[PDB]
Amino acid sequence: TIPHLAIDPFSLDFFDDPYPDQQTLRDAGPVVYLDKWNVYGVARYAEVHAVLNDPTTFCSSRGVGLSDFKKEKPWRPPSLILEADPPAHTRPRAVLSKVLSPATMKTIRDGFAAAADAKVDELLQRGCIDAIADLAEAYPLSVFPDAMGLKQEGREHLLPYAGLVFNAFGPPNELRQTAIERSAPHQAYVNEQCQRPNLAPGGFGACIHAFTDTGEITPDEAPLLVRSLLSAGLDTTVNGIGAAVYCLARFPGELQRLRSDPTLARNAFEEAVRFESPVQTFFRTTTREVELGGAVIGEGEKVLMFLGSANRDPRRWSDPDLYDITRKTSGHVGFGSGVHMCVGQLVARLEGEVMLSALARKVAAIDIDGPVKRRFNNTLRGLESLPVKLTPA
Ligand code: HEM
Ligand SMILES: O=C(O)c1ccc2cc[nH]c2c1
Numbered sequence: 200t201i202p203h204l205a206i207d208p209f210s211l212d213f214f215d216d217p218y219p220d221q222q223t224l225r226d227a228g229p230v231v232y233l234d235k236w237n238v239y240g241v242a243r244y245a246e247v248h249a250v251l252n253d254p255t256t257f258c259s260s261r262g263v264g265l266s267d268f269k270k271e272k273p274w275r276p277p278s279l280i281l282e283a284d285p286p287a288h289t290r291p292r293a294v295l296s297k298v299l300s301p302a303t304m305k306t307i308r309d310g311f312a313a314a315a316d317a318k319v320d321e322l323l324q325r326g327c328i329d330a331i332a333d334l335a336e337a338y339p340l341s342v343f344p345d346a347m348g349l350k351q352e353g354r355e356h357l358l359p360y361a362g363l364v365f366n367a368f369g370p371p372n373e374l375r376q377t378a379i380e381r382s383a384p385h386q387a388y389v390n391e392q393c394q395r396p397n398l399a400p401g402g403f404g405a406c407i408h409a410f411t412d413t414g415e416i417t418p419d420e421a422p423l424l425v426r427s428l429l430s431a432g433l434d435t436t437v438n439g440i441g442a443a444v445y446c447l448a449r450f451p452g453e454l455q456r457l458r459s460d461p462t463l464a465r466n467a468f469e470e471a472v473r474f475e476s477p478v479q480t481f482f483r484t485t486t487r488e489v490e491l492g493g494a495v496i497g498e499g500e501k502v503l504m505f506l507g508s509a510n511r512d513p514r515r516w517s518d519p520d521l522y523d524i525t526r527k528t529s530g531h532v533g534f535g536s537g538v539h540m541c542v543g544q545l546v547a548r549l550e551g552e553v554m555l556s557a558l559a560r561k562v563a564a565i566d567i568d569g570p571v572k573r574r575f576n577n578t579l580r581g582l583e584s585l586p587v588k589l590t591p592a
């Protein structure tokens with residue numbers, strides 16, 4: 200018997216306060232059935248980790264949102280990387296892994312760190328700033344579109360295009376419907392920027408298109424791979440940085456430990472990813488009967504993984520509701536796990552580290568001062584507005 204729960208993890212009330220319900224999702228049993236969306240769910244670390252690490256049984260090619268692409272029309276042409284299984288997955292994965300490699304990171308690191316220090320110096324001139332518009336959004340907007348080689352015009356579409364992508368993995372609720380109704384101008388902007396003549400030399404976009412020259416990908420595949428980094432590579436980093444600042448603001452003792460040792464920046468960012476989990480959920484579809492958490496699930500069944508919940512499961516983590524910058528974070532699933540584990544994670548940690556290093560060296564206190572506003576999305580967790588006073592060191 201699988202416990203049935205009436206919890207809607209894509210409701211606004213859930214997003215506004217997910218932690219009691221994520222507890223119930225873990226504590227009802229290792230596998231649950233959600234009445235609202237007629238789907239099975241796993242919320243504990245053990246099951247989440249196990250499902251991510253068996254892609255043959257728990258496939259991604261039938262979609263990693265609620266929609267089963269074997270039965271339903273995808274809202275757009277599927278991603279060649281996220282919505283593919285090995286072996287088809289492997290060549291696109293290899294392309295993007297090379298494009299966002301450690302060696303690539305070394306070549307852009309100094310520019311990113313200089314941008315982050317300039318950003319923080321400038322916020323300190325105003326003092327009262329919005330840690331989302333002025334920092335978690337503005338910083339990645341200042342580095343990532345340029346690292347891609349995007350033109351200046353139309354960049355206002357990038358944040359809402361990714362809200363659309365992340366809303367679309369959800370169930371058919373109002374967030375998802377309104378996003379698709381409003382999608383056409385964002386998709387048109389992204390489609391044009393995926394084309395080879397629109398991507399500046401030296402940037403990730405042109406680097407992807409250079410794989411056509413050796414035959415490693417076709418000219419039809421290359422724009423779809425650029426489209427993956429424009430879908431996945433901005434709003435996630437915005438929300439991880441936003442999380443990290445919100446954590447440092449709510450946990451003033453941790454900000455003082457980071458000031459005491461700025462080399463903790465990279466880990467303080469990793470721990471914000473665990474603690475907030477910007478990507479809260481993904482689905483897989485079984486490709487055979489499987490025993491999961493003691494229950495036998497049939498072939499062809501969607502399974503929802505609660506990544507945020509797994510990252511707070513007291514089965515795996517000591518004091519999971521505490522933000523601890525020296526936590527051993529290795530093994531969190533905020534970037535996934537296994538063959539699809541975030542191929543952009545070094546870009547994310549690069550941005551997060553240099554920004555928290557700049558904060559570590561320049562700022563003495565971060566105090567929330569003004570109303571905090573959450574942004575609701577089917578898959579992304581983050582704030583719309585976080586008004587803070589920054590006190591210079
Ligand atoms: C804090 C920031 C980020 C978080 C939390 C995040 C989270 C994730 C997660 C959970 C997955 C696994 C998907 C699955 O298992 O189905 C993933 C994969 C991926 N991420 Fe990220 N990511 C972040 C930043 C980035 C960036 C900066 C980029 C690109 C520049 C990126 C590009 C991708 C792509 C293309 C995949 C698909 C990899 C695959 O299917 O093999 N992400 N990400
Ligand atoms: O043009 C489209 O909307 C569309 C939607 C779904 C798919 C699946 C492969 N091609 C598509 C195009």
Ligand SMILES: O=C(O)c1ccc2cc[nH]c2c1
Nearest residue numbers: 358359361362363434574576
């Ligand atoms: O601040 C924005 O422009 C904005 C608009 C829509 C979304 C959807 C996810 N993040 C957003 C930011």
Ligand SMILES: O=C(O)c1ccc2cc[nH]c2c1
Nearest residue numbers: 278280281364426427430431
């Ligand atoms: O390949 C993509 O288009 C894509 C879209 C969203 C996500 C979120 C994690 N990885 C992604 C890849």
Ligand SMILES: [Cl-]
Nearest residue numbers: 275386389426
């Ligand atoms: Cl699209």
